[PDB]
Amino acid sequence: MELTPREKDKLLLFTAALVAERRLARGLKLNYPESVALISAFIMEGARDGKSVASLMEEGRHVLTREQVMEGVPEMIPDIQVEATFPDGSKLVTVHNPII
């Protein structure tokens, strides 16, 4: 595979997201790290599918709602940023106020 540090680093984010994903499935209200991990992993897979930056900036705001996370959590996350390899290289995706 010849994984570079950054690829191995993202593996951490992916795994962090698996944790959140399963707890969301159980019907729990997610906490701060769980939310950030989940939404981030969503965007990464989005770039894998080849969606545009513009599309993901919007789609990312509909992953988790205020009723699916602990109190105060939405306020702790004014935005989420993550980079992934789009068909046209690495790009930064910034989702503002992802949880409403």
Partner: protein, 553 residues
Amino acid sequence: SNISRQAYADMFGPTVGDKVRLADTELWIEVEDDLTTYGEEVKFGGGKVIRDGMGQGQMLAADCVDLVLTNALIVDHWGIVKADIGVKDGRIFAIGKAGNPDIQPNVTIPIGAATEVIAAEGKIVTAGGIDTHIHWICPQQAEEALVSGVTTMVGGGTGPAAGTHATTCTPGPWYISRMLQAADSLPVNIGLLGKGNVSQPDALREQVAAGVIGLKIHEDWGATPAAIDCALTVADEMDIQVALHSDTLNESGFVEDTLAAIGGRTIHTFHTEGAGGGHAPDIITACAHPNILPSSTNPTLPYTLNTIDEHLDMLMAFAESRIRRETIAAEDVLHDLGAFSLTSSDSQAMGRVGEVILRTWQVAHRMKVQRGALAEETGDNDNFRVKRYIAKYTINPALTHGIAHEVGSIEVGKLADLVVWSPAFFGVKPATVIKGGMIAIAPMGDINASIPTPQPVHYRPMFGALGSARHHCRLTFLSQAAAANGVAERLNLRSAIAVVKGCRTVQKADMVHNSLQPNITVDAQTYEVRVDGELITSEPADVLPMAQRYFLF
């Protein structure tokens, strides 16, 4: 020109009169003072103030600070004020108003070409924590503690050995030497404790001369009256501190016998409540004496629903004599009253190395909820309670071990060990950890990213924790004797050296905001704690702040 207080708060952080909630707790701090001149605040950025001829002066390096933390909200034992912080030569230069004297008024902290800038507007800045109950079971504990905001670690151990698992002792010259050398690789200031359990004073003197800044008396090595006396005698001689973990079994005598053996001499009692060790069931009565500097380990802070259940096994007939709901509940209140002066971890030996700060604030939260405002409180805020509690893991531990001339608080001349926090994550996850003037560790996003903010963001070591840079920014504490005998040169220690002093003259009265000596008694049968006849107790918490909202596991 004018500006609404809200827009101001968003731009330069809160000011005089503004309140801020500490994390997700019920504790609120109110800015007591602001050292700025409205309109002359320094801000860094494109087109902002810190620029040549403007906020940045033409002075040489010798005439300007190396680092300035702008618009910081300081929280320390002496006050909660808004100001700029200047750092020079790895130390705290001044707290005041930064800028360029050429065009700005009231500048006390000069910014020049040699000045790096850390934007602290909207951030809380505190002194690094100091943990005096460390079991050196593994080197990994250092990073864990640094991440939590603890910059100084005092303890003993040689690694995952039986003796270390149980006690904070670095046995003899050879091990002491080896650990002093290994200390150069760790990003925190360190001081070692030797085995104080012996009735031959020369065996102790050797250890002090070897390098330890204190001696640990532990019942597992024999906390007998003879041993205790011998340790204190050498302590008064060499100006070093003694940490005590008394006779739980009451084998050589009761609590009063131990107190007798100590003979009014200065001594630091570890985990004074008792669960972590000490005369069953009344070692807690020790906090009434003037020569006693009492501290708590963190598993019992604060009293919660699961506390008792978990403790039985972490311990596993004298179990139910050691683990008592009565003394555990009282401990929280005694902290709120200032009868207990310090907090520590007791790392991996009934204590959580990265939860010293976190737990202290949870105790404060719970006590406010249960007891309301303290008698010393003024205004509608928790400023005094905050100052009382922050002192427990900063200045008090520093005074207790004779190192307060170097660290412990944000004061001029002290080593620059500071922790920057975002209000929402105060006491849980820090924004920046500065060791001796350099960022040692901080949360960092994707390394290949266009900015340092993209995920994943996790704590990673910075330049202040690298090789020679690290050595220049950390301190290894030695006993006056060791320093004199040239131990640092002999062992070829590469880090900066600091000597401990004033360990024998410190007393309960010297503990900042925590000098209460209560007329406390413990019922031998029921274990009930009473101060002046009044029953001291509290209710266990079902849910706590600074918990499930911040952690992934």
